[PDB]
Amino acid sequence: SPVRFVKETNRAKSPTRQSPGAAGYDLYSAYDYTIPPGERQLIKTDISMSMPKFCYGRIAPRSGLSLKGIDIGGGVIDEDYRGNIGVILINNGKCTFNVNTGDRIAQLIYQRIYYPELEEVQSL
Amino acid sequence: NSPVRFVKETNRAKSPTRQSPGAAGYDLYSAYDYTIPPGERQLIKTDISMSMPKFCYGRIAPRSGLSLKGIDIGGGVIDEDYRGNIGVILINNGKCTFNVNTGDRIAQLIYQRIYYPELEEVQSL
Amino acid sequence: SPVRFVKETNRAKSPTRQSPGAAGYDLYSAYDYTIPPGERQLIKTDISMSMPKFCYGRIAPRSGLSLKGIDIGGGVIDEDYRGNIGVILINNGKCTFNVNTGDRIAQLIYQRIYYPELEEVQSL
Numbered sequence: 421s422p423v424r425f426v427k428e429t430n431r432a433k434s435p436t437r438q439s440p441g442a443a444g445y446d447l448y449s450a451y452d453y454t455i456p457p458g459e460r461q462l463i464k465t466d467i468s469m470s471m472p473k474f475c476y477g478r479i480a481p482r483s484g485l486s487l488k489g490i491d492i493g494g495g496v497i498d499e500d501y502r503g504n505i506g507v508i509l510i511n512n513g514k515c516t517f518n519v520n521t522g523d524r525i526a527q528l529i530y531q532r533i534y535y536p537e538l539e540e541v542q543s544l
Numbered sequence: 545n546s547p548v549r550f551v552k553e554t555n556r557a558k559s560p561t562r563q564s565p566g567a568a569g570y571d572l573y574s575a576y577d578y579t580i581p582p583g584e585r586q587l588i589k590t591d592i593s594m595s596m597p598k599f600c601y602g603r604i605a606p607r608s609g610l611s612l613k614g615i616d617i618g619g620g621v622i623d624e625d626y627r628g629n630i631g632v633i634l635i636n637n638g639k640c641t642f643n644v645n646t647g648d649r650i651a652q653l654i655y656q657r658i659y660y661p662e663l664e665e666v667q668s669l
Numbered sequence: 670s671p672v673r674f675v676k677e678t679n680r681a682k683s684p685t686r687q688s689p690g691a692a693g694y695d696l697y698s699a700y701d702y703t704i705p706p707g708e709r710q711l712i713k714t715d716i717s718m719s720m721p722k723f724c725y726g727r728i729a730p731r732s733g734l735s736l737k738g739i740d741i742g743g744g745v746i747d748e749d750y751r752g753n754i755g756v757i758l759i760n761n762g763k764c765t766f767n768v769n770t771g772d773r774i775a776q777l778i779y780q781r782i783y784y785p786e787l788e789e790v791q792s793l
């Protein structure tokens with residue numbers, strides 16, 4: 421029951437998985453960007469996916485980048501999202517951060533979730 | 545399986561809603577009026593408490609639109625046994641003042657499935 | 670499956686849950702640290718684990734610390750990570766943040782995940 425994906429352009433890199441115990445799948449920039457210190461930038465992957473059921477894709481940080489002051493904004497890829505998967509990279513470092521086409525920028529993690537019906541009660 | 549029971553602590557609370565059947569989270573709304581200056585954070589009251597589902601926690605997750613504006617989320621771990629008012633730590637990492645009005649959607653609650661394994665201390669792995 | 674864990678030094682403290690309904694197992698600093706405002710620090714726990722299957726450990730924030738402007742960077746502990754677990758504390762407060770050996774600094778949540786196959790298609 422694979423996750424089907426589409427490359428919007430030929431600049432997209434098929435998300436990679438390196439080991440059996442990796443949390444997710446590597447995501448790559450499809451374009452060149454420059455992020456000044458204290459600013460953030462939406463990074464296009466040019467990948468779209470028909471996501472698994474009862475799951476969401478978490479855009480989660482890479483460890484090396486996190487140590488360089490690069491943090492992740494937003495990051496909730498809904499199961500019903502069929503659009504371009506974007507990575508919001510936040511530069512909380514002191515220097516400019518460059519993003520080149522084909523650079524690893526994040527990992528996508530398919531996180532199992534629950535969809536309960538909610539009902540209001542008088543007390544818990 | 546069974547419904548998640550919640551309580552509106554005041555008439556200002558708004559029921560957490562999922563925008564679509566393929567949406568990850570349930571909308572959380574501000575129950576009060578706030579101003580958040582740049583470089584600051586604010587505990588936003590939802591006035592909602594809930595009896596959380598088993599083997600799960602509620603993640604307070606960011607909205608995409610607010611994240612692009614510089615609004616990030618602090619904390620965010622709503623324990624299964626938490627019975628108090630759910631609060632949202634909104635961080636203003638934008639350049640300008642961020643206004644929060646009553647009824648504004650500020651975050652999304654994701655019911656994330658988890659494990660509670662027993663931990664055993666060994667000498668080698 | 671029980672999670673097997675190792676203390677690298679006697680400075681390490683066993684991760685525990687504060688209650689039967691707590692999401693996270695508390696993580697503690699095994700050393701003294703000082704984090705300036707607007708800076709981050711990788712914190713050693715001196716704890717290694719054989720992580721459970723179809724899971725990753727999320728380094729998640731403590732709530733009181735988050736109110737003080739202490740955030741978590743990185744924080745993805747892969748299922749096949751067998752090394753020292755490090756917490757990246759980001760001091761987004763206005764004053765210096767002190768970490769003393771033994772201080773509770775984060776919580777580890779064992780988050781259930783999916784490892785699906787990926788297949789490229791022309792259209793979803």
Ligand SMILES: O=c1ccn([C@H]2C[C@H](O)[C@@H](COP(=O)(O)OP(=O)(O)O)O2)c(=O)[nH]1
Pocket residue numbers: 479493494495496497498501504505506507508606607608609610
């Ligand atoms: O970092 C992110 C966050 C979200 N999305 C996508 C997936 C998600 O399903 C959609 C959310 O868009 P929206 O309709 O603007 O929702 P919101 O109300 O959260 O802004 O955008 C991304 O690609 N990257």
Ligand SMILES: O=c1ccn([C@H]2C[C@H](O)[C@@H](COP(=O)(O)OP(=O)(O)O)O2)c(=O)[nH]1
Pocket residue numbers: 604618619620621622623624626629630631632633730731732733734
């Ligand atoms: O952003 C947050 C973070 C936490 N909490 C609530 C839910 C959670 O179950 C409780 C945790 O409180 P604690 O265990 O007393 O604090 P700490 O995390 O510092 O141990 O506070 C919120 O409402 N919003």
Ligand SMILES: O=c1ccn([C@H]2C[C@H](O)[C@@H](COP(=O)(O)OP(=O)(O)O)O2)c(=O)[nH]1
Pocket residue numbers: 481482483484485728742743744745746747749750753754755756757
């Ligand atoms: O806050 C963190 C983040 C990561 N790691 C560990 C666990 C993870 O499995 C490993 C990943 O390191 P990497 O793969 O070498 O770095 P990157 O993610 O940049 O490829 O480092 C930590 O201990 N703490």
Ligand SMILES: [Cl-]
Pocket residue numbers: 478603656727
């Ligand atoms: Cl998460």
Ligand SMILES: [Mg+2]
Pocket residue numbers: 687
């Ligand atoms: Mg606690």
